[PDB]
Amino acid sequence: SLSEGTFEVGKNTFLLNGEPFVVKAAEIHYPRIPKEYWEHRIKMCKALGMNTICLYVFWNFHEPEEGRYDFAGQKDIAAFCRLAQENGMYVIVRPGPYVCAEWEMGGLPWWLLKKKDIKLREQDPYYMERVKLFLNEVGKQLADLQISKGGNIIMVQVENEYGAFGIDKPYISEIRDMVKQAGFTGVPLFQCDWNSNFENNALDDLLWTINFGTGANIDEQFKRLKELRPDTPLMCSEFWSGWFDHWGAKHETRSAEELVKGMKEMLDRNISFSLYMTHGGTSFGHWGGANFPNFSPTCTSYDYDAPINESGKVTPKYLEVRNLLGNYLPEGETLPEIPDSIPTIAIPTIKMTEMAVLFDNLPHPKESEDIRTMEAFDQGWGSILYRTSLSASDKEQTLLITEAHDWAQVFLNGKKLATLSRLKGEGVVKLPPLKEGDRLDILVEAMGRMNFGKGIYDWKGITEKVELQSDKGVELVKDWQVYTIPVDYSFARDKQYKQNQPAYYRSTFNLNELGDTFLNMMNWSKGMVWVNGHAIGRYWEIGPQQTLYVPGCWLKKGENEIIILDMAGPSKAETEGLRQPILDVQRGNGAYAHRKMGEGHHHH
Where does alpha-D-galactose bind (predicted)? Predict the structure, then answer.
């Protein structure tokens, strides 16, 4: 076997193979970076002056269906770690089960919600059992990569900021035991929390660390920790810097100044850290999360205004941090060279030739007397259509959908009547006089499940009931035909394309030269996109994001295929490839209630 290296918690310092070592880590999310660019992004982190990469492990990404573990291709976290080792970069693993990170349900799998009374992030028998099985799989993948086994992994995390969730040491203790039983026994295990709550779940046999963002007061952050443990090395597990967007909210950026300063204060005290988002990348497909308690979906782009932008390019911020770090290098040391950027191409207008109307391409219906959530129909992602028939009526009636989780379109005999957005907490629809048998269609699109606090308990579809009010009172609407519309590329491809309402659009285009491009979705309403089978992510006319990053590595010389699922109908069925992204263009009326639009001068 390979020789055994070590990483230890020393006296006021970390020791890498017996020598003091300051962890200068780059936070990276392997699911948000095309597997073909992992190497490139790793090199960018290296030339930046980082010596370590911190990796959250996204549970639902690897086990989208109970029992169906996946660690191949984009999900091959071992491959990423090896790539990291091949570039002399150490790794710190945060194996979940919960990771937050503005990701779908904070990393927890939707199928856990199939158990109505499931209790998350505590010793619920079913939850704990799945956590143990998931961790064991992660162990089979990364345990042999611990530094103690010739690998590059120096530390492993126990849970994630539990202090901001509750107080349950027995739970944390069991999680710790599972991590150890999973195979991670050769390196130190650590906890991370806030200066104001780390004592609530702090275990004595574990390293304690603190998380905070730009503008924090270093001394005020570690003051208490030094008291409890005078000899413990200090580490800001996650230094949050930058800004991630939300649909319907103004785009923002953070100054390189404040960052460089914050990073210098810690460096000047030999305080270890992980720049929370050295490279954000993209929340491809349906993986983006959402804010809690006020539902707010994050944009597809996870640029974060990080040193390394979404497409992996150098930014003024990169240079400023690279130059800063370049000073704290060992005596007689030179920073590695900055890798060349990936070329960008502009693709000429692509006209969607084929079109397939969703209502004319429905899967088999699931029949249900009462309303049930999407998960109750064994679906975790995509859209879900609740259809029924209504009795005749002479006068107008009103429909109250009690919690269309996320975004719904309501149709009467195919004609759109209304659009209800969870961002505004809407739920009422006006019905005109009805004829016996009129068809009521309620198409509910599920966006990301909230990823913070109790937001993880986020059921999609219609959560409780649908009520009809008439001159005779209010009654529940029952007897439903339920159609689950999955996000699988396979489902989007298998449609009756031919040649207002929800539809799949398709077209092929030829390329003679490759490179990264940004699809202009300015002509479209809302939905998701696939290019050569890859799920590029969601888009929404309201912005701030208007383009979708498409990696050149997912493009091919010759014929390329693009499929777009548009929910409300485009202004024009065509898109184009730009060489620059659009992340600061908003459209339409406020997507949120005025008190959250953050602006008031002369409304009305």
Answer: 56, 99, 101-102, 160, 238
